[model samples]
Target: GFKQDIATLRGDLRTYAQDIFLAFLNKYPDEKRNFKNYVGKSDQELKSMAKFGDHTEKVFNLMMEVADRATDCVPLASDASTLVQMKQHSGLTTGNFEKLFVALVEYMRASGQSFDSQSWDRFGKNLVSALSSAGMK
Candidate 1:
């Protein structure tokens, strides 16, 4: 069951991954350093993103999970677990995370894909609260 859900989610996100990341950099200019210079030169580099590239996908996926459950979905465990390499650098701070969701909503709006008021309310607050409670702030 988990494997099927994983494949489905990954497949769904494949097209939007690049857009999400670029939008993230656009929103937080300083955060750009987390993805560009130190990242590797290969696909493998983007997955772990321990130094750069960053695991933007995993973070967002977990955010969505929180939205679905309206609870703490999962913790990134204060460690960088690899999708295909070493692990992620995980620079997601609590205060900064709210900005991230804000940027993501703006990105969706720019792309003509807006989340409804309810969905936004559901995911937006939960994500921030979850990360904040985990001491990201």
Candidate 2:
């Protein structure tokens, strides 16, 4: 399965999940502003906000789950509807989800986390399928 391609990076996923989220925010400051709770907060300040931890866990856990649940995307989509709804209500685009994943991959590579192309492909497939199925554009 594609998970095998990413098996090597799972440890990096666990270790740098929060950092990866931060990287995404840093890359797209506009998106960060959409997080009203984080608006005007510095990155360091954001680390202290409960909402930051909560959101990081919310999104990062999906990353972990995608690796584990890629075998069946339907259930994953059902589970992710809440996220889709939240993003939609906030006027965020589904494309940002893919961007975040790409940021994660970039972060992993910079950290020397090695994984095969298939691993990244599988992870991406899981993410896109779930989000699309959940009614994301």
Candidate 3:
């Protein structure tokens, strides 16, 4: 029944999909346009690509599916908070956290719900506080 809501949200999803497409294109220019051609290619063909390594297109496709599903649910703010906590504990400011946050927000917006960054920040802070109170460092 949420399909109508989802259809209205298709633009956002398309935007993110485009981002994903561009990223892939940038990485594999010549073959990028033919991405679909490789979708069901034999394992031998994939292995011949050398750089495909462990990063199979199948895995990326699966991630895309996950991203698609996420558009219908409230994005988890806790995941971002967890990354912050892990970074703090490890004393490493890996920018990957921000990237993940952006991806999550994009997915949320694509699913038909706009996410307020400030609200997410507040939620993340509160989550950290709750965890701390629960004896988690």
What's each prediction's TM-score? 0.55, 0.70, 0.24
Mind giving the per-residue lDDT tens digits that candidate 1 earns over 10-42?
566644554566566666777656556533344
lDDT of 3 by residue, 54-78 (tens): 3344333433333334433333345
Can you tell me which runs of candidate 2 are displaced by over 4 Å?
A: 1-15, 72-90, 116-118
* Local distance difference test, each candidate: 0.49, 0.64, 0.41
Better of 1 and 2 by lDDT: 2
Candidate with more favorable, higher TM-score: 1 or 3? 1
Model 2, residue 122: C-alpha shift (Å)? 4.6
Give the top-scoring candidate (TM-score).
2
RMSD of candidates 1 onward, in order: 7.3, 3.7, 11.1
Model 3 TM-score relative to the real fold: 0.24
TM-score, candidate 1, is 0.55
Which ranking of candidates, highest TM-score first? 2, 1, 3
* Candidate 1 global lDDT: 0.49
